[PDB]
């Protein structure tokens, strides 16, 4: 059975902190920002070329 509000482990104040300060949204923003400092994947066609195999058609 789904639990009711009164049987919740977290206090209302902590839940309200997460609610008003957008905790998971800031976690998402941080994960996005981490990509900004990684090596990109692009290659510079037509000066470079993607992989080609003997079987290519």
């Amino acid at each position: 059975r789904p639990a009711t509000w009164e049987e919740s482990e977290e206090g209302a104040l902590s839940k309200a902190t997460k609610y008003f300060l957008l905790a998971e949204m800031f976690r998402g923003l941080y994960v996005v920002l981490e990509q900004f400092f990684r090596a990109p994947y692009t290659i510079y066609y037509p000066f470079e070329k993607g992989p080609v195999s003997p079987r290519f058609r």
Partner: protein, 340 residues
């Protein structure tokens, strides 16, 4: 007269080129957050990309659909661009350093902002494409609703200063930036400036996936240039409002000690060095804000119309009225009503 002309040309050129390069900066930043490169080919390191798009659009034919009021369809983008640019006349880059030093600077900002919903309200009537009409009504609703939040934060800040001169509001912040005592108010101004600008996640106004394109579905050539330019200029301008209301404007740090070391009397060198310091502080604040607009665009999915209306009118507005009650109460408790 000559000096006035040179100042206006310098300021206008800086603003127009900053808007032009904000588009390139957006593409490049989103690109690197998406593990790709973005424009790096039209001009060295993709620095001429914006002018390439400009020239192309100025060479594009203007299409006036059959059921359209052509005068309104061509003039609506023009008025929204004009107001978006007129808003810049009061922004200071240093004490008194602005094109318009008005004692009613704040009131001017709010008024010219309130003149910003007319492009959305008029284009849907002008296009007559149905997608444009739905977008136009929903946008007008969203924009006015969030303009309320922005005006309310303006009022809360003036509660601390008791002045409608922008430079004075900035000067009062040498003691502390107002984003320190009012951090929650700064969060709300960002969430609302995003919405008032119609940016993602709150891009319901011109969202390609719900409605193809948006109110601009029918806008080709220079009218599209105008909507584009007005949108990015408004982004920068509302970042400016944020800057001087909450981030201390052109204030960075107390450089009195440093100047007393470097110089021994007033000179054009020292005035220029001070001007550069103030302007650099204000421009770095603008840059962080624009980066944050782009960051939020990269990170979140869109809202629905019901969702954002519910947000503004049931979660934000009650909190703002509560703050209306609690700020003067704290002033009264500690006997700190600000003088004129």
């Amino acid at each position: 007269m000559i000096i006035n002309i040179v100042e206006i040309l310098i300021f206008l050129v800086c603003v127009l080129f900053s808007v032009a390069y904000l588009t390139v900066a957006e593409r490049k930043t989103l690109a690197y957050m998406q593990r790709r490169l973005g424009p790096n080919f039209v001009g060295y390191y993709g620095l001429l990309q914006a002018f390439a798009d400009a020239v192309k659009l100025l060479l594009k034919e203007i299409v006036l659909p059959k059921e359209s009021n052509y005068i309104i369809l061509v003039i609506s983008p023009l008025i929204t661009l004009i107001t978006a640019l007129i808003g810049w006349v009061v922004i200071p880059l240093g004490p008194g350093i602005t094109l318009g030093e008005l004692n009613l600077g704040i009131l001017f900002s709010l008024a010219i902002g309130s003149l910003g919903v007319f492009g959305s309200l008029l284009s849907g009537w002008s296009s007559n494409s149905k997608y444009s009409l739905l977008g136009s009504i929903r946008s007008t609703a969203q924009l006015i609703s969030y303009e309320l939040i922005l005006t309310s934060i303006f009022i809360i800040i003036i509660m601390f200063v008791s002045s409608l001169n922008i430079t004075t509001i900035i000067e009062t912040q040498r003691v502390v930036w107002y984003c320190i005592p009012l951090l929650p108010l700064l969060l709300i101004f960002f969430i609302a400036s995003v919405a008032e600008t119609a940016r993602p996640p709150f891009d319901l106004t011109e969202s390609e996936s719900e409605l193809v394109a948006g109110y601009f579905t029918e806008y080709s050539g220079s009218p599209f240039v105008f909507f584009f330019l007005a949108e990015y200029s408004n982004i920068i301008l509302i970042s400016a409002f944020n800057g001087y209301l909450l981030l201390g404007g052109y204030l960075s740090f107390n450089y009195s000690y440093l100047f007393n070391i470097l110089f021994n009397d007033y000179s054009y060198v020292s005035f220029l060095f001070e001007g550069l310091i103030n302007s650099s502080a204000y421009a770095i604040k603008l840059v962080f804000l624009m980066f944050s607009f782009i960051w939020v665009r990269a990170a979140f999915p869109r809202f629905t119309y019901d969702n954002l209306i519910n947000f503004c009118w049931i979660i934000l507005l009650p909190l703002l009225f509560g703050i209306f009650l609690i700020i003067p109460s704290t002033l009264y408790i500690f006997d700190s009503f600000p003088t004129l």
